[PDB]
From a paper:
A large superfamily of enzymes known as glutathione transferases (GSTs; EC 2.5.1.18) catalyze the nucleophilic attack of the reduced tripeptide glutathione (GSH, L-Glu-L-Cys-Gly) on nonpolar molecules that contain an electrophilic carbon, oxygen, or sulfur atom. GSTs function as dimers consisting of two similar or different subunits, each with an average sequence length of 200–250 amino acids. Each subunit of GSTs has at least two binding sites, the G-site and the H-site, which are able to bind GSH and the electrophilic substrate, respectively. Glutathione transferases (GSTs) are involved in multidrug resistance mechanisms and play a significant part in the metabolism of alkylating anticancer drugs.
Residue numbers in the entry:
A (entry chain A), B (entry chain B): 1 to 209
Amino acid sequence: PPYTIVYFPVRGRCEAMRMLLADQGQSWKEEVVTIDTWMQGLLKPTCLYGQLPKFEDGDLTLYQSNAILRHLGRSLGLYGKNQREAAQMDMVNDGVEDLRGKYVTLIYTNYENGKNDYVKALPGHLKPFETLLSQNQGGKAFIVGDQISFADYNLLDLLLIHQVLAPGCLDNFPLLSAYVARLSARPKIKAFLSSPEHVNRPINGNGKQ
Amino acid sequence: PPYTIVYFPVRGRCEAMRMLLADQGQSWKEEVVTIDTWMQGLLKPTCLYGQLPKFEDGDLTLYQSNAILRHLGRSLGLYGKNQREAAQMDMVNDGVEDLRGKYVTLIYTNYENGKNDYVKALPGHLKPFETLLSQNQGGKAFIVGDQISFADYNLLDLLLIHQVLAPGCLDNFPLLSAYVARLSARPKIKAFLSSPEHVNRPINGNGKQ
Ligand SMILES: N[C@@H](CCC(=O)N[C@@H](CSCc1ccc([N+](=O)[O-])cc1)C(=O)NCC(=O)O)C(=O)O
Ligand SMILES: N[C@@H](CCC(=O)N[C@@H](CSCc1ccc([N+](=O)[O-])cc1)C(=O)NCC(=O)O)C(=O)O
Ligand SMILES: [Ca+2]
Ligand SMILES: [Ca+2]
Ligand SMILES: [Ca+2]
Ligand SMILES: [Ca+2]
Ligand SMILES: [Cl-]
Ligand code: NA
Ligand code: NA
Ligand code: NA
Ligand code: NA
Ligand code: NA
Ligand code: NA
Ligand code: NA
Ligand code: NA
Ligand code: NA
Ligand code: NA
Ligand code: NA
């Protein structure tokens, strides 16, 4: 510590890490970058890959949202109890990222023309997570093992934004539906999800959701 | 162990993990899935995300090429020496993956019309790695720290396929070009790169490179 998130004024690729920090009782500073500031081209060339988020943990500076999540998972004990679980958590998180990338492409480049196709294909992309839950204590714990991990926070965020895109998309995924309800009721997450800083933040930068 | 790689008959997303295994003196089985077999639709529904590679390590079955890389990195001691290095290796590997995804899209969907633009944009995407090398012992060690890591095997593979796609792409990146030469000279890597199994395997599945 201390922690600083440097990002556009959206939920996007930072809401999962924010929920993680909140659920761990951690404070952090937000440095909000506006689009007009970004277009001036001062900050962008100083970012490793030209993009946000940028994240500071003490004198450690990171880019890449999933590297930040993994770092928080490693440093706060949210990465499983052994190597087998850590590998499975990575396999989950990579699957979350694959679907998130498709979501972002829909939202930002093809919303009107692509949404129907996307929603029709969505059950096939959610089923793997239902299956994973079914095989871990019949789905009554977390996505891997019996302790929450960085992958849970990312998966939870992914599921929540998809419930906005496609209400009832979890109607046929009972384990995922109960998992979302359960994690959402964790007191520090419930408080985060009703906090003004989260509620007033749009999901994406173009207002579509 | 023992290790099995289940994958299409290409280098693709498995040549980095193959190099890693070869360099660490490990043996593995290749279960090659032809296009004809894959299109029979028997194996695909049993894969977690409907895709390959699939990886078996004793009784652990994994998917997701980067999760497999991280699992081999964790279990074989190729993940740095502290939390700081591990986070930086993740930030590197996520950048490698971002470019790999763009490479795959070019190869399989848009080679003829997209190649000129892709090659024009390539230096901008390789520069971050030259910069990281320039800040870690003037490029004479590895991408993070002074021990080879899973991120090195992935970055090496990314650079090698880009040298075939765009000869001379490292001409203005002397650290990256020296790094490719040095790591390719590691005796077990050089032997793997000379082996008929690798030499006869096409980079991609569509005859383009
Ligand atoms: N692989 C990276 C991907 C990061 C990424 O896509 N960053 C986008 C922001 S998230 C998506 C996004 C885009 C725009 C806004 N906005 O408010 O205008 C918000 C969010 C970015 O920096 N874009 C600016 C650029 O490339 O110059 C990661 O996981 O962190
Ligand atoms: N995020 C995943 C991405 C895996 C992926 O793209 N898998 C591709 C194979 S790699 C690219 C590829 C495509 C085709 C061949 N080929 O020889 O026919 C080889 C490699 C796949 O399974 N495609 C089949 C499908 O989706 O049904 C990862 O990192 O492992
Ligand atoms: Ca985003
Ligand atoms: Ca789309
Ligand atoms: Ca591939
Ligand atoms: Ca499976
Ligand atoms: Cl819970
Ligand atoms: Na905001
Ligand atoms: Na997002
Ligand atoms: Na997020
Ligand atoms: Na990632
Ligand atoms: Na996925
Ligand atoms: Na080592
Ligand atoms: Na990404
Ligand atoms: Na593909
Ligand atoms: Na392209
Ligand atoms: Na360009
Ligand atoms: Na070494």
